[model samples]
Target chain A: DVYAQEKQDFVQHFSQIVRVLTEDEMGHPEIGDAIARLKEVLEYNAIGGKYNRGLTVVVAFRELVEPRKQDADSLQRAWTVGWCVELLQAFFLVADDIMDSSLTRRGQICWYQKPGVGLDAINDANLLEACIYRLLKLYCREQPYYLNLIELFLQSSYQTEIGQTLDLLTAPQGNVDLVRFTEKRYKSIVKYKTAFYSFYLPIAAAMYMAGIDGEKEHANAKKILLEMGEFFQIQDDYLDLFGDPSVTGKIGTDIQDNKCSWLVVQCLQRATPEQYQILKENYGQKEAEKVARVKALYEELDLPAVFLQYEEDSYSHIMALIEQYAAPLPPAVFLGLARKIYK
Target chain B: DVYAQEKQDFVQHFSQIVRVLTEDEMGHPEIGDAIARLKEVLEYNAIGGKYNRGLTVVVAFRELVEPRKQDADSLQRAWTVGWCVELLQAFFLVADDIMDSSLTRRGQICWYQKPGVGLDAINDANLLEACIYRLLKLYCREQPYYLNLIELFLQSSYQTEIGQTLDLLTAPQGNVDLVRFTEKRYKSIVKYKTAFYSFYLPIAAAMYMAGIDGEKEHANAKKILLEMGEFFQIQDDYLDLFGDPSVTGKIGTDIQDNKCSWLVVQCLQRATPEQYQILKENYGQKEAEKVARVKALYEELDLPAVFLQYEEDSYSHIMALIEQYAAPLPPAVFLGLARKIYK
Candidate 1:
């Protein structure tokens, strides 16, 4: 009930955030049609997400801070910071869609793929990122945690870009380079790409806001959170092959796109020589039949069963680590996130 | 002579900046081939400019600070700040090339146009931008001006993106929107797109570092600097149409590409009804003769003579502003920039 209530509040607050950001431009006659275009970009790309990542900022802040301390200003900062996290996500997804040549996102056409948008989406994405700092300055400029938040966002962005660079290099479209798809490489890619911002950033942001500035405490949080991020990504890779498209809201293209996905690495480790040969031939092909053959090979290797086992082990491992590390801060912080993705 | 010497030192210091930024990546084995790609990006896109904008940071810092106070740390910060300016330019240019569908820049293939690069330059551009904060944090995080610098860079980025959005909508590819090509619109685009970062950022940065953070002083500097930036860009537009390609280092495509360039706006302002009809038909076409027809119309309107008159007036306007505003601070700070661009 609390999560559901918060999500509703988040959606409402998010509209205010968009308005506060674009209101000046809307009134400025000099900007003309550019304001309308920007408003469309913000609404279409920044909203419509599950809000899981942004909501995590608020939830984590609530868990970490005292109820008595959670006054109006604190609540406002939490909401603004939560929206900043969402802006970062919007920034990444907008650019990522272009890089992946993705056709759609969140059930709508990707911004770049929209008529007349094209490469201009690149600047649109940068604007989304710039909004994070703009919002931060407007709300948190005088907060002691201001520099920490800026640095956290900046470092998270850098780590994500590094992860992206690795992802692009390891699994270029149409390249089919299995030699680069070792389990080790896959972990590196996911850890840097998915884990840092998705798992560590929001919690760390809350910790900073709650005045938990110890390097060791942040590192402890990162250790548990990154493990959870890895598990979350593994589940995503597994679901890509096995989940219903209607449930997932999209079809899986990782196999055809030559992504260094967890499933492929697992398949590589378990496959026999003949099975490996079959995978080598069918992997990274666009044709439906070839993709199906790769899926069949994954099934023959019993990847679904392996993923089930892996999921259980990962859940236990994360719980143990969280039990060890999520102290002075509540275990529920980690547990809450683990519960979301573990399912 | 001072400008020439500073330019040489800038080139030398620039290599050091690149090496420092990428050296850690070069040693990181987990990233595989990404380090190489990043190095190539830095070398190709971030370097080889005339270094005018970047050098302004160092020159202004030296002029603003007492020579006895310019220690090694101060010099290092100046150089780091200088490179940060270059990084910003690199970020814009890389993305600009993609949006413009440019083939070459600074006498080499644009990064996006290179084989295997394509849209990946979007990320490369972002990486270039991320490096600005990286260098700032590395060199100036302890200074009181840290937050000021971050805010400055962030604001500069937002302004440029807004300008870019306006520019894109004003002169979309294959769309001839002559009505958008007005002097007012052109001023807004150039001021936000080019003036803030190019003219204001470096000098404002030096002023911040020199502990000159008065609001009025910054406003005064911006008034003078933005005027110079306008004049500078107008000259750039003139050169785009009339300057020799070999001397300019690249051919101009403003007419063929349907850009809302200063020339087109000037021509529009001065065009007769018949001339306007010629432009309406001939502008924004890729064919050689059509581009020539647009140029012929400019000649018929005596646009070069108009530019010469405009140049003289702009120069005098800027010099008078500098005399009125450049105080407490050395007048040479403004005069040096004026000397570099006035010719």
Candidate 2:
């Protein structure tokens, strides 16, 4: 992972902000002891992540501000900005886990799933959001881009909530019906709900804060970053179906969750009447054998080959855009991210 | 009654900042429609309250700044700050209704109870919080005490959460035991959870932003404001128990919620063993007859007279502190509030 070391860099950056915020949150008079305990639970849940989104701010800023070549202060600012991106993601994940009723996340019991948390997790999620702004007010309060960042974070959160709403409406309790799974709908949902925050937000914040305000530059940056997000999500979908758990560190459960993963949705789009019937019957079934049956059907449909072709198309599309329309941005930044994830 | 016109003043002062934020939040691409809907919900819910806490911002700031005969801008700022106070209260109430599983608020069904809301109301509540900072940033970003204002709001929220946690723990599922209730604990709970935000926070923000500072001034302010908060809550407890619904415009359900309102705790503290037995059986009962019986026993115990004595003592104690200890603050402000509330 090209970002593996850089990931640590951002997580450490975030830890400092988290430390101060945790103290302030818990040290305030009233329920000091209990708030402190809640802070610990929240802090514990924040650690251990791939930190791809976290590192994107640095990469995007490095690209967007190549001519000025961010000074030490700017670089440090970029890192702090990057850390907010990571925190924002963690906030979404924590809240999403509750909404999804998931038992574990990042190989640990979800924060709300921990004993005594229950519905209080809702408040904990709020604390997480408050911390994002608190860090912004501390580190970037004087920056012209502070309001921009706040607005972006708020917009992204709302977007994610919309996507989540659509996801819920489309697949209530993960019930799988072939009719409800459409490639177009899945793409729209992910783009609006997931891609904006995951891909557009960090980079957008960094770019705007770095004083790169030209629309063309932002548009070009979005073009590259969103493609990256789509590719990254597609790979996540693939890994759910094919990657080794020993390497991915996750036992795939997307099938059981009846997720409209790229492969699953594409499969549904391509399935014959009989195959679609089988999918409708078997998808989201908890039985291990049924899950295996669906997986075997995926193989029979040559989804792995389909994913390879999709990956190839994504790479070529990104390459063509970079060659034709890259702004006055450092190509190295985009190249670095692409190299890390494209393989 | 003191704040009967305060809600109108708050809305007028806040209309500008709200308009900007409302536009931006609604312009959000993914959830703009949802956010606009939520904005309507918030405005509807926030506009009709007694606005006592909101008005306290104006009253307390007048105490601090006196404005040398009250400049229009100063009055407007105080009212704007007052609106912020109201918004924060709205923020908590929207979320609290969900947490409490309550059926109604402000004599209407809780926001979460509406169709198409359910748990997604959590997101709407978050939007309410974002709106607070949005207003702060817009209006108070350049203020000398911007940080102080933000910190006050943050600290107050944390305090309120702690109070809420204790309340939830103490009265989970309407279970109330007098053994778990003590005068010291009740005071601690009320001061931290209820009083700080309701009484101190609005004024604290106003005072600091208005250029009042130092321990002597602030300490005296805190002493008086917190006492006022206690008195306000005691009044709320009284109204819950005995106020005419037509006059009060809201019915009290604290007993049904097993809330440790001042009345219940005071009654329990002074009750004989037989009276205590009546409480154990009749408190927090859902049955209308049981509720009436408990209320009747409260009458038999001469609770009305106790409340009258308590109100008299609390009001005089507050007035004496204002008379003796209010420093670097205009006496008119405190006296004005006292005159308004006591009558």
Candidate 3:
């Protein structure tokens, strides 16, 4: 399938659920507005997304499943499953935007921030979640592996929420408690919050689709992917403060949000007493001067060099895990993820 | 199972999820804080709640399953799944409180309204949803009926959210457009929002567990159960305004909240032009006089009489549905629900 068509079809396939919803109350004056709002929420999310993680679902499915099994129907289900990952992302980001603030960072309109929508975005986020299960049932309800897929999706969601719970606890808004930003906490946060969904869920989903639902098989795949997830997020944290527009495509708000980023945790370790004082005063402050000072402190500690060294070690570490775990299956599955993350 | 022990066990069983979560990061200061917050969120939710819907799961399970299957292990799973439904309720109510307001209607302290909670309650609501799945897997992962149980839950959640979407759209807060308050809209909201989970989900779970998961069997059960659900909600609406404190236990805010109640919708249909104006003016206001007038309008339109008549008709209609649809299985499942609801 053409990548463009796959992505477009998966995104547009939302109407199946919408049809079921609307068919219940046709020609009703009240349902029209509800449907419109539903459409608007989906449309907003369908844009500005890179499709990288969703694309991973399709790619992993191709490699993991047998060639004979990769029929048109199978491909469609894979694509549909891929889009479920995207919707999961959409659900998280929409809710996070509200929890962080109603469209505070960007220009004025999160789904929660729209004129007609306020806290109702929370419900819309839930609607996105409901859509995931709807699509799973729509596309794969007949498959023997349906329960595996559902459980995998649900476990990913729970893991990510647990991570988010840990994340929120570490960095309460408006209070810079750098002492709480320990390496163990940061790793757990990244591992649970970002790694599982981003790195593990898509491949784990494809693996399930291929009838590879063994406990040991999943544990092996999860081990490599979670490692890749942590490395990828650490890179993201580094990029947020240090990367160029050409590579990162845009800026990040880690410093201003006082996120428990890799850099902040590293800074806590290396900073002298006086340098720590500067960070305590300057970090988490939203003013331009304060943000820049925090950035300057990161440089003074040679954190970029540290990231490069850590980056190299992560690659080495992941390659070794793949060599150890990627048996009875092609290493390309793990290697592809590593190359993408390292790049 | 004994009701008191069952309910108590279900409530206290939250510790299993907490233990798994905490054991992952023992003695870590950061995780300790996260765990504490998690406990706080759970404790706040476990109070002041009658486990009516959750109890329905156990009751239905006992009725549907053979006595031979009612071993300790099966009984425990039933209790656990029953609590999963309660958590689902907890998830929705927590978010609804926030979306509706930070505990606005009363001398407020919603989970979201708590001093430290605020918007983090969104994440907490999500955690509660995640908990339902966690418990489902913990107890029922080995059961052949696990997939059926999960699909039932996901379906109920999606249906409820769709109903909530409709509910929010019909009455955009501070904007009372009575024209949207048609009988069709009210019925859809009540059925989708209140009926399916309240009526169908628990019984459906027991049916699946009993290996009675035939499509026709479910459709039959759903039809009778949904009618029971709608009637139950309508009764609540009538009792909200019309019942004595001795019976109702407390007054309700459906009037000021501009809820699409049976009384208000009936008044819309039956009110004269002058009376409709009275409703349009006095409805949804916070002032005591405004609330009293809305009640007065409901009384003048003889809504109590209409309700009593509708109540009788609904009971007759439901008995007919049970006779038509509840078969092969005992009618006691349907009859027990109706007796409890109608009384």
Candidate 4:
């Protein structure tokens, strides 16, 4: 409930974007049908996610820009941009669900899993991605920071795509290799796949909007934010196996998916020959027993304690980076993000 | 051989873009593997097509810009932007192949069809798209019209996605209904899907680069180019089934794939009860004889003659538009495109 009011305002801004993109086409003879489908795409895929990424933009903008500059128009823009990140998140999820062949997302059946949407989900995903640029143009086109925002979104998108590629390459379906699960490669996957867009994009977008787009300032923000991205993804990796399902709101399938999660990497490092054999056999199977065996092995290796130690070090490391690099900008901007991740 | 040297230079410009995107990541030990995959994605999927779209950008840049302004650096950027269009094409095709479940492209197995690739092609498609902006930034970040170019690419991307969605919705696999195939819907599909990115984007990029991006000029260019796009795609539909395979380089599968081609739509328009029943029985079937029957019905209905009349009208209509609209700028800018399409 910390950014509760901001989250509500951000969520409400969805209507205008959908209106802008679709209402123009509503009067068309044939395109109205496509517009209806697009509205569904935005509502179903864009809204259901936890609004962490969107909320980050509004909160960060409030902190970074001076109070007088934070007029109604600027706040409207902050909310618009905040929702842009959410739109990007929606685009990635709708497509990722297909690539991963995921069954459900955010507690509903995955968009691709719907009866009529099989592989046509691919087109829907592209529409979702294209909407990101459309939204950027509609809202931010006249701003001085317009180019910076688009480039940041594009760069974050590229980095995330590379990261997803790395993740897929490291753990190709049905071809699990524990040697491929090294800490270094796992970190690379997390940094590229999760860190850049999910963590860095929102704050960096706020910085750009506030006209704080100096190369040095942007670079400083990226360093601290990417580290947060890494830490956040690793924590996610740990939570999948360890956190209570009620708290996490879903079951974990990283093992069945043959995902290269942090727990597995840590387990591989500590494993004996017999323990390693269990992992190789049970890692990626669909059977319940196999997942259980892999989970048991992680517990036997004491990965929970290992994760705690890593989490502590990550917190300290992030704080140190913020202390050094979060200069000129308020330290609160970095600290608030840190609290959300670690709390 | 008309834009032969421009085509060669556009083709050669590929290496620098590859170098810029990948070589910078070369020093990273972990990312080299993904870079290799990206290079293969580009080489296999981006090349071997008719260089029509990329060449349009370079040739139009040459024709539209004055000799004094078209320096070596400007020519380089022109080629760079030309390849950006190609990259966008690759992005669309790689993903489209996946959605269409197409087995082959450009005389080779589709990228997703290759062993060990499959759904990972989704991420590769996203990477290919990211390369468009990456190329734009690398070459044209300082130019006056960079934002215009990005906006044009983005808007074109949106229109094409809408076009694709319309096509997929009109002719969904396993649920074929010939009643859905109408002249209006088919034109909507082609105009949005093929015409925007393939026809308008390249020339608009040239116009933007040459500083001819006045609202009136673009509207004029778009009006003509979209018409050309419609004609070109309609011709493609005609050739897919009716053209000599030796000349077209591939066998047509529009009938089998449940596509909303102009041939099918026109046939639907002209069918008698007997021919309509034959189409209902045979269209969208996997059987070779079923496909042959549909093709035979198309012949019986004289679609080739229908296409010839349409082609001639499309030509004259396009000519009238060019004469009326292609002012201030040389008429040859559009006339060359017309000649290539008609011939």
TM-score of candidate 4 relative to the true fold? 0.97
Candidate 1 lDDT over residue span A1-343, tens digit each: 4467799878889878877888777567788667777888889898888888888999999989999999999989998999999999999999999988988888888989988899899989998999899899989989999999999999999888888988888877657879888888888888888899998999999999999999999999999999998988988998888989988877788888877889999999998889988889988888999999999988988989999999989988998998899887899898888877887
> Given candidate 3, what's the lDDT at residue B229?
88
Candidate order by decreasing DockQ: 4, 1, 3, 2
A103-165: candidate 2 lDDT, tens digit per residue: 988888998788767766776676666666677777787888876776677678766765665
Cα displacement (Å) at residue A327, model 3: 2.5
Candidate 4 residues lying further than 4 Å off, grouped into runs, are none
Candidate 1 Cα outliers beyond 4 Å, as residue runs: A26-28, A246-249, B26-28
What's the lDDT for all of these models?
A: 0.88, 0.74, 0.83, 0.88
How many clashes does the backbone of model 2 have? Answer: 0
TM-score for each of the candidates: 0.97, 0.77, 0.93, 0.97
- What TM-score does chain B of candidate 1 reach? 0.95
Which candidate gets the maximum DockQ versus the true structure? Answer: 4
Residues B98-165, model 2: lDDT tens digits: 77788888877888798766676666666666566667776777878766776678778767766776
lDDT of 4 by residue, A1-343 (tens): 5587677777788888788878868567587678888888888899877799989999999988999999988998898888888888988998899988888888999999998888888888888888888777877878999889888988989988988888888888767777888988988988888888888899999999988999999889899998998889888888887888998887888888788888888888899999999999998889999899999999888888888898899999999999999989999999998998995
Q: Residue A12: error of model 2 in Å? A: 6.9
In terms of docking quality, model 1 is medium
The 10-residue segment of model 4 chain B with minimum total lDDT is B1-10
Clashing pairs in 3: none
Give a tens-digit lDDT track for model 1, residues B148-183: 998899999998999899888888875787997899
Task: Quote the positional error of residue A234 for candidate 3 in Å.
Answer: 1.2
